[PDB]
Amino acid sequence: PLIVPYNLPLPGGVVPRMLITILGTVKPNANRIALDFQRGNDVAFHFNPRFNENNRRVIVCNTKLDNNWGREERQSVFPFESGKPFKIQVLVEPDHFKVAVNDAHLLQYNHRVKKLNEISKLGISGDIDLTSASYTMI
Ligand SMILES: OC[C@H]1O[C@@H](S[C@@H]2O[C@H](CO)[C@@H](O)[C@H](O)[C@H]2O)[C@H](O)[C@@H](n2cc(Sc3ccccc3)nn2)[C@H]1O
């Protein structure tokens, strides 16, 4: 049981074949969740489930540079359900982050920030009860 918002240090940044696992439970009337993989103040990879944007559920992903959001990447495949236990796995690959939820592939996001070994924090926020956050090499 971890207090949200939660900061997970990623020592020496990320690297291909590093797997980051987030476990928790979605709150009963959730509206939003966010994962923010940060390089200093920049956000290399923002992963943002939205449960009610114009009465649709959507995943929004983006990058923040010098305090400005860039081009959003959107999709309607949406695996989360309010009130349920979830697992998000983010696997760093050479050209992209890959995300799987509850053991089903969800999306990939190409690397816009290229200094991977400087992406040294993961922020976890929004409408969840967070159980644990950790990493391993596969
Ligand atoms: O681009 C990614 C960002 O998008 C904006 S919303 C964006 O705003 C633009 C300008 O008005 C419109 O042009 C676009 O159409 C529209 O999508 C979101 O507010 C950004 N966010 C999401 C979250 S979660 C969260 C929020 C509070 C507390 C905990 C977790 N925290 N920050 C980010 O997701």
Coordinates of C-alpha atoms and ligand atoms in Angstrom, one line a residue:
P1 CA 0.0 0.0 0.0
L2 CA 1.6 3.2 -1.3
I3 CA 0.4 6.8 -1.0
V4 CA -0.6 8.4 -4.4
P5 CA 0.9 10.4 -6.0
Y6 CA 4.0 8.2 -5.7
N7 CA 7.5 8.7 -7.1
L8 CA 9.6 5.6 -8.0
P9 CA 13.3 6.3 -8.6
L10 CA 14.8 4.6 -11.7
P11 CA 18.5 4.7 -10.9
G12 CA 20.7 5.4 -13.9
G13 CA 17.5 5.8 -16.0
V14 CA 16.0 3.1 -18.2
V15 CA 17.5 0.7 -20.8
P16 CA 16.1 -1.9 -23.3
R17 CA 14.8 -5.1 -21.6
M18 CA 13.9 -3.2 -18.4
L19 CA 10.4 -4.1 -17.2
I20 CA 8.5 -1.8 -14.8
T21 CA 5.5 -3.3 -13.0
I22 CA 2.7 -1.3 -11.3
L23 CA 0.1 -3.1 -9.3
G24 CA -3.0 -1.5 -7.7
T25 CA -6.8 -1.3 -7.8
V26 CA -8.8 1.2 -9.8
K27 CA -11.1 3.4 -7.6
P28 CA -14.9 2.8 -7.9
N29 CA -15.7 6.0 -9.8
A30 CA -12.4 6.6 -11.4
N31 CA -11.9 9.4 -14.0
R32 CA -8.2 9.4 -14.8
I33 CA -4.8 7.6 -14.2
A34 CA -1.3 8.8 -15.1
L35 CA 2.2 7.3 -15.4
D36 CA 4.9 9.9 -16.0
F37 CA 8.4 8.7 -16.9
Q38 CA 10.5 11.8 -16.4
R39 CA 13.9 13.1 -17.5
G40 CA 14.4 15.9 -15.0
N41 CA 11.4 18.2 -15.5
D42 CA 10.6 16.7 -19.0
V43 CA 8.2 13.8 -19.4
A44 CA 9.6 11.2 -21.8
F45 CA 6.5 9.1 -21.7
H46 CA 3.1 10.1 -20.2
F47 CA 0.5 7.3 -20.2
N48 CA -3.0 8.6 -19.3
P49 CA -6.2 6.5 -19.2
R50 CA -9.3 8.7 -19.3
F51 CA -12.5 7.1 -18.2
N52 CA -14.9 9.8 -19.3
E53 CA -13.7 12.1 -22.1
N54 CA -16.8 13.1 -23.9
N55 CA -18.5 9.9 -22.6
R56 CA -15.8 7.7 -24.1
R57 CA -12.9 5.8 -22.5
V58 CA -9.5 6.6 -24.2
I59 CA -5.8 6.2 -23.6
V60 CA -3.8 9.4 -24.2
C61 CA 0.0 9.3 -24.4
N62 CA 2.4 12.2 -24.9
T63 CA 5.8 13.8 -24.1
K64 CA 6.5 17.1 -22.3
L65 CA 9.5 19.1 -23.2
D66 CA 10.5 22.5 -21.7
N67 CA 7.1 22.5 -20.0
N68 CA 5.0 22.0 -23.3
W69 CA 3.0 19.0 -24.2
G70 CA 3.6 17.7 -27.7
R71 CA 1.5 15.6 -30.1
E72 CA -1.0 13.3 -28.4
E73 CA -1.2 9.6 -29.4
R74 CA -4.7 8.3 -28.8
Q75 CA -6.5 5.0 -28.9
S76 CA -9.9 3.5 -28.0
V77 CA -8.7 0.0 -26.9
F78 CA -9.2 0.5 -23.2
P79 CA -8.6 -2.4 -20.8
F80 CA -9.3 -0.9 -17.3
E81 CA -12.5 -1.2 -15.3
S82 CA -13.5 0.8 -12.2
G83 CA -13.2 -1.0 -9.0
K84 CA -10.9 -3.8 -10.3
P85 CA -7.3 -4.9 -9.5
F86 CA -4.9 -4.1 -12.3
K87 CA -1.3 -4.7 -13.5
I88 CA 0.5 -2.3 -15.8
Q89 CA 3.7 -3.6 -17.3
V90 CA 5.9 -1.1 -19.2
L91 CA 8.8 -2.8 -21.1
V92 CA 11.5 -0.6 -22.5
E93 CA 12.6 -1.7 -26.0
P94 CA 15.2 -0.2 -28.4
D95 CA 12.8 2.0 -30.3
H96 CA 9.7 2.2 -28.1
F97 CA 8.0 1.7 -24.8
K98 CA 5.6 -1.3 -24.8
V99 CA 2.6 -1.4 -22.4
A100 CA 0.6 -4.4 -21.4
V101 CA -2.3 -4.4 -19.0
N102 CA -3.5 -7.5 -17.2
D103 CA -1.1 -9.6 -19.4
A104 CA -2.6 -8.3 -22.7
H105 CA -0.6 -6.0 -25.0
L106 CA -2.1 -2.5 -25.2
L107 CA 0.2 -0.1 -27.1
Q108 CA 3.7 0.9 -28.1
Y109 CA 5.1 4.5 -28.0
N110 CA 8.2 5.5 -29.9
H111 CA 11.1 7.1 -28.1
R112 CA 11.0 10.9 -28.6
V113 CA 13.4 11.4 -25.7
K114 CA 16.5 9.5 -26.6
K115 CA 18.7 9.8 -23.4
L116 CA 17.2 6.7 -21.9
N117 CA 19.7 6.5 -19.1
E118 CA 18.5 10.0 -17.9
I119 CA 14.8 9.0 -17.5
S120 CA 15.3 8.5 -13.8
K121 CA 11.9 8.8 -12.2
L122 CA 8.4 7.4 -12.6
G123 CA 5.5 9.4 -11.1
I124 CA 2.2 7.5 -10.5
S125 CA -1.0 9.5 -9.9
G126 CA -4.7 9.6 -10.3
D127 CA -7.7 7.5 -9.3
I128 CA -6.1 4.3 -7.9
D129 CA -5.1 2.5 -4.8
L130 CA -1.5 1.7 -5.4
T131 CA -0.1 -1.6 -4.0
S132 CA 3.5 -1.7 -5.4
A133 CA 5.8 -0.4 -8.1
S134 CA 9.0 -2.1 -9.1
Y135 CA 11.4 -3.1 -11.9
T136 CA 13.5 -6.1 -13.2
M137 CA 15.6 -7.0 -16.2
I138 CA 14.1 -9.7 -18.5
Ligands
LIG1 O1 -1.5 16.1 -23.9 C1 -1.4 15.4 -22.7 C2 -2.0 16.2 -21.5 O2 -3.4 16.5 -21.9 C3 -4.0 17.4 -21.0 S1 -5.7 17.7 -21.6 C4 -5.4 18.4 -23.3 O3 -5.5 19.8 -23.2 C5 -5.2 20.4 -24.4 C6 -5.1 21.9 -24.1 O4 -6.4 22.4 -23.5 C7 -6.3 20.0 -25.4 O5 -6.0 20.6 -26.7 C8 -6.3 18.5 -25.7 O6 -7.4 18.2 -26.5 C9 -6.5 17.8 -24.3 O7 -6.3 16.4 -24.4 C10 -4.2 16.8 -19.6 O8 -4.7 17.8 -18.7 C11 -2.8 16.4 -19.1 N1 -2.8 15.7 -17.9 C12 -3.5 14.6 -17.5 C13 -3.3 14.3 -16.2 S2 -3.8 13.0 -15.2 C14 -4.0 13.6 -13.6 C15 -4.5 14.9 -13.4 C16 -4.7 15.4 -12.1 C17 -4.4 14.6 -11.0 C18 -3.9 13.3 -11.2 C19 -3.7 12.8 -12.5 N2 -2.4 15.3 -15.8 N3 -2.1 16.1 -16.8 C20 -2.0 15.5 -20.2 O9 -2.8 14.3 -20.3

